[PDB]
């Protein structure tokens, strides 16, 4: 009911956000600083996130810029970026690292579009499964006595709404990602 529903909404939300996070790891044709969010570099023997040693910004619509705090940490940062994508050929001068985004081919756009559409369906299925389990919990209460057949039917509706609402956020994120792929 109340708790169950909220629990379902919070869980569905976690899935929607999980979809957007994995969608941001896909490199497109436009400079997107959020793509290097997962980069990690060994700092004094400790695995450290990129954001803690440098600053990723946009200098061009097709080029990224990574300013490393510790200049000595430049080679490692540039190496950690190359080891994560064979398509990235950066260029450093001092504490800066220029990272141009290679324009996608029509075949790559298609290939990348399929992958995003696949993660979306998986994200959509996760949201339904979250709703399905919330319903199974309510059905259990109805099987007892606490809940009437009216409460249960209402819960199913509310849960159905939560699913459609979350699935909408996934289709919107998907659509946006698709647009970026075909546009550049």
Curated annotation (Swiss-Prot):
What stretch or stretches form a coiled coil here?
none
* InterPro entries in the record: Ribosome_recyc_fac (IPR002661), Ribosome_recyc_fac_dom (IPR023584), RRF_sf (IPR036191)
One of the record's GO cellular component terms: cytoplasm
Phosphoprotein among the record's keywords? no
Q: Name one GO molecular function term.
A: ribosomal large subunit binding
Residues the record lists as N6-acetyllysine modifications: 161
| This protein's UniProt keywords | Acetylation, Cytoplasm, Protein biosynthesis
> Where's it found, cell-wise?
Cytoplasm
- Supply the Pfam families for this chain: RRF (PF01765)
Query: Could you name the domain of life of the organism this protein comes from?
Result: Bacteria
Q: Which SUPFAM superfamilies match?
A: Ribosome recycling factor, RRF (SSF55194)
Instruction: Please give the biological process terms from Gene Ontology that the record holds.
Output: cytoplasmic translational termination; translation
Question: Main localization of the protein?
Answer: cytoplasm
The entry's function note states: Responsible for the release of ribosomes from messenger RNA at the termination of protein biosynthesis. May increase the efficiency of translation by recycling ribosomes from one round of translation to another.
Q: Which NCBIfam families match?
A: frr
Instruction: Give the UniProt family note.
Output: Belongs to the RRF family.
Q: What is this protein called?
A: Ribosome-recycling factor
Q: Which organism is it from?
A: Escherichia coli (strain K12)
Task: Provide the gene name from the record.
Answer: frr
């Amino acid at each position: 009911i109340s708790d169950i529903r909220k629990d379902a909404e919070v869980r569905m939300d976690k899935c929607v956000e999980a979809f957007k996070t994995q969608i941001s790891k896909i490199r497109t044709g436009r400079a997107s600083p959020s793509l290097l969010d997962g980069i990690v570099v060994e700092y004094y023997g400790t695995p450290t996130p990129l954001r803690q040693l440098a600053s990723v910004t946009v200098e061009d619509s097709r080029t990224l810029k990574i300013n490393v705090f510790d200049r000595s940490m430049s080679p490692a940062v540039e190496k950690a970026i190359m080891a994560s994508d064979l398509g990235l050929n950066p260029n450093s001068a001092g504490s800066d690292i220029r990272v141009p985004l290679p324009p996608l081919t029509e075949e790559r756009r298609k290939d990348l579009t399929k992958i995003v559409r696949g993660e979306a369906e998986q994200a959509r299925v996760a949201v339904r499964n979250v709703g399905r389990d919330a319903n199974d919990k309510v059905k259990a209460l109805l099987k007892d006595k606490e809940i009437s057949e009216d409460d249960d039917r209402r819960s199913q509706d509310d849960v159905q709404k939560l699913t459609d609402a979350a699935i909408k956020k996934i289709e919107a994120a998907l659509a946006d990602k698709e647009a970026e792929l075909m546009q550049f």
